[PDB]
């Protein structure tokens, strides 16, 4: 019976963290309609270019074309147009043997751990 | 369909080039003929195919065509009463097609694609199907072969083809996804078939031999290992396990063993009869033979094809028994492909992943609930062949950490033609304490206590045998001579099978309990006769000892009246003494 009450408690605690993850997933899905959207996308593209020294190709969406063409005329890059990405950009390095994706859903899913610690500590 | 050419041939190992994107452990057709190989050691764009047939006469330049699928068995109706080799090809169709010699490179389908099977559906339009549920039955011989959904297919049934008779290739169910479920289905042979839950085994695997279910039993969901050097039989024990059991179907996989055993099993089984449903015995055997002179890499796939077919009959509810003969020949097959592949070995040539492969094989046995709700089990008896004696081998000690029952043969105990050669000083079984409520309901009430008295008497006899050999026969006072003689009666009357006599071969639990009760009543009443001053040499020629000694030959029907008459003879033969 004590395992019954404790497992009911921890699964009820887990699904609320799941729905907080749902809220932030939708509030990051509805980010490309905002006036600071080329600012945040070119900031993330600058970080992705920064972590990979001297990229060659930069993969972005057909919707993500016009907001960052000033990046596509400096730093030696050449842009590639592909709708494979939902968020963020990609940096193709030396000979296609290295990519650095900097999509937003990937940033959430990778950084979720210590942020989940702080989310549970903030909510309790 | 990644297509390339041969770059190198080395033994049965074809190192092909031009393959950049072939998946590891696919099956690719090597050579211009159409030979079969499995692909490992990717390197750049250069594969490492091993062939499964012979390899002589090939060149450099012949195309190799990657099918892009792993080693897949086909599962469905038409596998019982059937012989296959290590890549699931029917040997009767090969013998009809090419001759009396197993040639290289011939493609016959596993399940015969033209027999008309009756179909009786058990789903309707607008139902939902999950993995492993039933879609309807097909009557095979006297079984009821219910056909399954494949274990990675679910959805909603859009149409069902009606009742009639059909062919195994014809798509009988169409889901509401565009997919169509046929009668057979393919399954990758190394990925184990799923279950819902594994239970604990609590019902014994009755094997018709007295010692191997009385003193060292094995449950329905357990594993057992039989070692034994040459001349210790082991083949008649595997065949007796196959002939006289309670398991509904038997997969007899022989990897690297002589062809005379396989032609014995194939010839004489249509004349026998299982003691559960009548008819032939060969209608519950799937036998996967791979003779010694057949190629040396197919021994690896023969075991996995056998255990995947055993899990297929386990998922249908049937209790399956898998007899895997000469798994050390599979160990030598792994040694051959490893030393072809230039790896560093460990402990006499065997690759270091050997015990992980043997655990992956012996893990598939068990007693599960299936995905379709019903309950099934599969039990593996693996015959290991060490070189000579030598239980310190890597394969023997590597299978010894896994198996629940260990059945050790001897040569010295088999050179005296005492078959079976089960050395009970070294054999063991972990399933004795778990099979006790089944015993206490279904054979007797005091049955564990009685065979514990038998085990105590045998350990006493085998301990005292040493000083009997040392001092001679004289110095044993009164009742230790009786311990010798009762132990001799046990190992000549209860433990010694024949397996060729028409009624001594199969021995159910009631007759074994009866012979046990005879011997213990004789011993207790003879000790009660020797505590009062009767010579021990007088007792050892009473006629009721002969009535005990020939009591392994009274039939199953003729037993109980004979048992009660021998009990009153045991009583009324010591009153005069």
């Amino acid at each position: 019976g004590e395992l019954l009450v404790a497992t009911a408690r921890t699964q009820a605690r887990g699904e609320v963290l799941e729905e907080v993850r749902r809220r932030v997933r939708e509030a990051l899905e509805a980010l490309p309609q905002k006036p600071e959207w080329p600012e945040v996308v070119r900031k993330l593209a600058l970080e992705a270019l920064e972590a990979l020294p001297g990229a060659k190709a930069l993969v972005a969406n057909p919707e993500d074309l016009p907001h960052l063409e000033a990046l596509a005329r400096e730093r030696g890059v050449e842009l590639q147009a592909e709708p494979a990405l939902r968020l963020g950009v990609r940096a193709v390095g030396a000979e296609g043997k290295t990519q650095v994706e900097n999509s937003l859903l990937a940033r959430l899913d990778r950084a979720w751990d210590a942020l989940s610690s702080k989310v549970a500590q903030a909510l309790w | 369909m990644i297509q390339g050419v041969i770059q190198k041939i080395a033994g049965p190992a074809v190192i092909a080039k031009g393959m950049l994107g072939a998946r590891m452990y696919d099956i690719c057709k090597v050579g211009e003929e159409g030979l079969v190989g499995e692909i490992i050691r990717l390197d750049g764009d250069t594969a490492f195919v091993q062939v499964y047939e012979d390899t002589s006469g090939l060149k450099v330049g012949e195309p190799v065509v990657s099918t892009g699928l792993p080693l897949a068995v086909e599962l469905g109706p038409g596998m019982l009463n059937g012989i296959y080799d290590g890549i699931q090809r029917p040997l009767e169709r090969i013998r009809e097609k090419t001759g009396i010699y197993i040639t290289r490179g011939v493609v016959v389908h596993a399940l015969d694609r033209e027999k008309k099977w009756a179909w009786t559906p058990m789903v309707k339009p607008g139902d939902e199907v999950r993995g492993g549920m039933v879609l309807g039955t097909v009557p095979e011989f006297g079984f009821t072969h219910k056909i399954l959904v494949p274990p990675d297919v679910r959805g909603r049934v859009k149409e069902v083809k009606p009742a009639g008779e059909y062919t195994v290739e014809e798509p009988v169910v169409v889901l509401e996804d565009g997919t169509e479920l046929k009668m057979y289905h393919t399954w990758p042979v190394r990925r184990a078939r799923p279950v819902q839950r594994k239970l604990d085994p609590n019902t014994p695997f009755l094997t018709g031999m007295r010692i191997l279910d009385v003193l060292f039993p094995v449950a329905m969901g357990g594993t057992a290992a039989i070692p034994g050097p040459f001349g210790s039989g082991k083949t008649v024990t595997q065949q007796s396990l196959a002939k006289w059991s309670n398991a509904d179907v038997v997969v007899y996989v022989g990897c690297g063993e002589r062809g005379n055993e396989m032609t014995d099993v194939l010839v004489e089984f249509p004349e026998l009869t299982d003691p559960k449903t009548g008819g032939p015995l060969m209608h519950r055997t799937v036998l996967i033979a791979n003779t010694s002179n057949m190629p040396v890499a197919a021994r690896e796939a023969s075991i996995y094809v056998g255990v995947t077919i055993a899990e297929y009959f386990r998922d249908q509810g049937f209790s399956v028994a898998l007899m895997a003969d000469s798994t050390s020949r599979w160990a030598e097959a792994l040694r051959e492909i490893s030393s072809r592949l230039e790896e560093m070995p460990a402990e006499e040539g065997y690759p270091p992943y050997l015990a992980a492969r043997l655990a992956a094989f012996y893990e598939r046995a068990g007693k599960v609930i299936t995905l379709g709700g019903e309950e099934g089990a599969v039990t593996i008896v693996g015959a290991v062949s060490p070189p000579g004696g030598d239980m310190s081998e890597p394969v023997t000690q590597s299978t010894l950490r896994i198996v629940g029952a260990f059945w050790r043969l001897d040569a010295s105990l088999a050179f005296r033609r005492h078959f079976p050669a089960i050395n009970w000083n070294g054999s063991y079984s972990l399933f004795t304490s778990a099979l006790d409520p089944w015993y206490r309901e279904n054979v007797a009430e005091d049955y564990p206590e009685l065979r514990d008295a038998i085990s105590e008497l045998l350990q006493r006899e085998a301990g005292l045998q040493e000083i009997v050999q040392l001092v001679g026969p004289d110095a044993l006072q009164d009742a230790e001579r009786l311990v010798i003689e009762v132990g001799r009666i046990i190992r000549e009357d209860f433990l010694q099978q024949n397996a060729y006599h028409e009624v001594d071969a199969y021995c159910s639990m009631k007759k074994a309990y009866g012979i046990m009760k005879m011997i213990l009543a004789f011993y207790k009443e003879a000790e009660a006769a020797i505590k009062r001053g009767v010579s021990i040499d007088e007792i050892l020629q009473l006629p009721v000892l002969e009535r005990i000694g020939r009591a392994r030959y009274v039939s199953e029907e003729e037993f109980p009246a004979y048992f009660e008459e021998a009990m009153k003879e045991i009583q009324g033969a010591f009153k005069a003494l």
Binding site: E2, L3, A6, T7, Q11, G14, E15, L17, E18, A48, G96, K97, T98, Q99, V100, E101, A106, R110, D113, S117, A120 | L20, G21, A22, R23, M24, Y25, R41, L42, D43, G44, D45, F48, P70, R190, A192, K198, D200, E343, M344, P345, A346, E347, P351, P352, A355, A356, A359, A360, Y362, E363, R364, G366, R401, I402, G404, F406, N425, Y428, E466
Partner: protein
């Protein structure tokens, strides 16, 4: 972000070689994904400026070279640990298989541990009784000790481990403190067990109710044979956390370390590396040492780790490198015997090849009783006389022996039937010393040369 690498040059066995990977740190975890989206764990075990070797933590079936991006995760290999995992179950990688949600990790620790400082250790000192009479009287288990159960191939090692799990307690009234009874927290690290032994451990722990205090890192036999490397490290990470930052009394049951040494033999033979004895590599002493020596008690804190490794001695000897090096790192072993289990004795512990190097710290005056060490030594000498007089019986026969030689032969088998043999009964330390004196009373004085005169004057008979 999430960097990636394509360009795997070579996949074979458990290994695959990525190239142009200068940013994969050594000892870092990668995840490998093919065209079917399924991910696979892996770890780097060589970094060059050219290329980088990676061991794969799952089965390598289905990979190819036109796909299978290898991405980086967690710069050094870490386990995210909370306190909320005291009822859960996990696989070899560290993920829950019970249908429950994943945890909220408070800290994240490095998995391989850091070596504990010898200045900041404390002496393992407080007497655990285990109920088993041989372990309580003769080979004492003291809280903060490493002692493996060397077993055979069919011997009941799992039942003895479960019995020590279900009834090990510390008695503070003998110790002199009281002060509470907080029970143990079990960490059960299973490496390649076969659902039979697993069902026995789970059914035992659920009938006794220990699953609300015990974490189970289960790595079953069909699961891949590389994450057996990862399993004891991410079990002793939780053991060190729950003992040295939350003051529990963690007992770890490291099941069947021979599977761990088999996994090391595999990964050491796939690297073309210098063998030791019987094909096991050179660094097997160092890896078994950095599993085992992550136990004990520390100075100025409250916790305790007690390791019971379980060993399957291959040809039931002390000469194979696995039980041999295990006995070299650890402090004492408890060894099971094939003879006593054929005679029907449970627990079949023969006390001659078994010992405990931390007995003298936690027995004796004011901690067990005033006669404990001396009763142990006299039992050892007299049972050794019985053992080596049975060989004389086997040589010459009994009726050339006199009476005092026969009293030892009666002591040996009365010992084996009454002191050693006990079916699941919890004989405490006072009753076990009472039975020890009841067996020593089969010998006359003048043949008890290791017991002081007031002890033998007041306890005898």
């Amino acid at each position: 972000l999430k960097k990636e690498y394509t360009g795997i040059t070579y996949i074979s066995g458990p290994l695959l070689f990525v190239e142009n990977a200068k940013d994969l740190a050594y000892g870092a975890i990668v995840d490998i994904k093919d065209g079917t989206g399924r991910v696979r764990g892996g770890q780097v075990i060589e970094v060059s400026e050219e290329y980088a070797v990676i061991q794969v933590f799952e089965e390598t079936t289905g990979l190819d070279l036109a796909t299978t991006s290898v991405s980086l995760v967690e710069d050094v290999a870490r386990l995210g640990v909370s306190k909320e995992m005291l009822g859960r179950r996990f696989n070899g990688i560290g993920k829950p298989i019970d249908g429950l949600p994943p945890i909220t990790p408070e800290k994240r620790l490095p998995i391989t541990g850091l070596p504990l400082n010898p200045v900041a250790r404390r002496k393992p000192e407080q007497f655990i009784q285990t109920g088993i009479s041989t372990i309580d009287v003769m080979n004492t288990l003291v809280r903060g000790q490493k002692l493996p159960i060397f077993s055979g191939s069919g011997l009941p090692a799992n039942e003895i481990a479960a019995q020590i799990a279900r009834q090990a307690t510390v008695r503070p009234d003998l110790s002199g403190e009281g002060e509470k009874e907080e029970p143990f927290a079990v960490v059960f690290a299973a490496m390649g067990i076969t659902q039979r032994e697993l069902s026995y451990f789970i059914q035992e722990f659920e009938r006794t109710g220990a699953l609300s205090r015990s974490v189970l890192f289960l790595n079953k036999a069909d699961d891949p044979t590389i994450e057996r490397i990862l399993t004891p490290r991410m079990a002793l990470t939780v053991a060190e956390y729950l003992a040295f930052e939350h003051d529990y009394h963690v007992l770890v049951i490291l099941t069947d370390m021979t599977n761990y040494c088999e996994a090391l033999r595999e990964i050491g033979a796939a690297r073309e590396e210098i063998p030791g004895r019987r094909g096991y590599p050179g660094y097997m002493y160092t890896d078994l040492a950095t599993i085992y020596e992550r136990a004990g008690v520390v100075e100025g804190k409250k916790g305790s780790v007690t390791q019971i490794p379980i060993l399957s001695m291959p040809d039931d000897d002390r000469t194979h490198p696995i039980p041999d090096l295990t006995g070299y790192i650890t402090e004492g072993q408890i060894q099971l015997s094939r003879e006593l289990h054929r005679k029907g004795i449970y627990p079949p512990i023969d006390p001659l090849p078994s010992l405990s190097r931390l007995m003298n710290n936690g027995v004796g005056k004011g901690k067990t009783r005033e006669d404990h060490k001396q009763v142990s030594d006299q039992l050892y000498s007299a049972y050794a006389n019985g053992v080596d007089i049975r060989k004389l019986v086997a040589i010459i026969g009994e009726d050339a022996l006199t009476e005092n030689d026969r009293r030892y032969l009666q002591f040996a088998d009365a010992f084996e039937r009454f002191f050693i043999n006990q079916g699941q009964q919890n004989r405490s330390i006072e009753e076990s010393l009472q039975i020890a004196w009841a067996l020593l009373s089969m010998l006359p004085q003048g043949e008890l040369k290791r017991i002081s005169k007031d002890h033998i004057g007041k306890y005898y008979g």
